[PDB]
């Protein structure tokens, strides 16, 4: 199916507690494969997926060089943004960046991304044209200007259409037994009286990969969006994810309710009911 690669950078200032921390992690879809942490005893790029371990010394050295350089420039960038917002030296602040490429089911580039945030708010993003920028405010307009002057977009476009896709494709092949394996959810419905006249039906999905899934309840075939309690999809810790959806129903009306499950790993979607 469709696949993506992303790198996530977090640079955090911490006045009085040393220089800003820089962390980078890399993902293919929902699988992390590398990390770098400037706070580590010996900061270097480390593998976090078995299929990446085969990459040679030059790969690891080159990654580590990039992240070490970014550790330094992101410290300067934090200084710059403090100034753009007229902020005091006392506060902690964070720049985040996420960038990468999306492939369609045939393996070709769908689109690229390079987005940054400051203190959790949109700051500047590369447009889908991979040629122009969207700046959130007048501070970000200053960054835009510098980036326009330095032809950053052109460089991002070259990476996103080139190296990004090429490497993603390589990882997909090297990790094909997992990265290209969809594991369907294991499902069941539970029943718990909440009173004499009402009970909870909870529809469970466990052990699935990737994280994307749809879990809905219907009553008499009508979606129950407003009445469904839906927890955020959560990692099990073994690569797989979990989710559930709950509905409180009048006692005696249980068979009027159906749980529906959509997941890439499902030969066909599921319809489930409580089985007393």
């Amino acid at each position: 199916g469709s696949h993506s690669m992303r790198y996530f950078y977090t640079a955090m200032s911490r006045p009085g507690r040393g220089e800003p921390r820089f962390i980078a992690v890399g993902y293919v879809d929902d699988t992390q494969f590398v990390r770098f942490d400037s706070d580590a005893a010996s900061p270097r790029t480390e593998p976090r997926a078995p299929w990446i371990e085969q990459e040679g010394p030059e790969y690891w050295d080159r990654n580590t060089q990039i992240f070490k350089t970014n550790t330094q420039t992101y410290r300067e960038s934090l200084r710059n943004l403090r100034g753009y917002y007229n902020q005091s030296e006392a506060g902690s602040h964070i720049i985040q960046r996420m960038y990468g490429c999306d492939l369609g089911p045939d393996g070709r580039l769908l689109r690229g991304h390079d987005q940054s945030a400051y203190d959790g708010k949109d700051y500047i993003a590369l447009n889908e044209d991979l040629s122009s920028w969207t700046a959130a405010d007048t501070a970000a307009q200053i960054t835009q200007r510098k980036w326009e002057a330095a032809r950053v977009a052109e460089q991002r476009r070259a990476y996103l259409e080139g190296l990004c896709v090429e490497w993603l494709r390589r990882y997909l092949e090297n990790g094909k037994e997992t990265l290209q394996r969809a594991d369907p959810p294991k499902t069941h419905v539970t029943h718990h009286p909440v009173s004499d006249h009402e009970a909870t039906l909870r529809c469970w999905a466990l052990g699935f990969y990737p994280a994307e899934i749809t879990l809905t309840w219907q009553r008499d075939g009508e979606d129950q969006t407003q009445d469904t309690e839906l927890v955020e999809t959560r990692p099990a810790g073994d690569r797989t994810f979990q989710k559930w959806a709950a509905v409180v129903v009048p006692s005696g009306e249980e068979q009027r309710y159906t749980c529906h499950v959509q997941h890439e790993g499902l030969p066909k979607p599921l319809t489930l009911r409580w089985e007393p």
């Binding site: 990654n63 990039i66 960038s77 960054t143």
Partner: peptide, 11 residues
Amino acid sequence: HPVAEADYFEY
């Protein structure tokens, strides 16, 4: 593989 920044890259 991450993108390499140009020298003196800054916000």
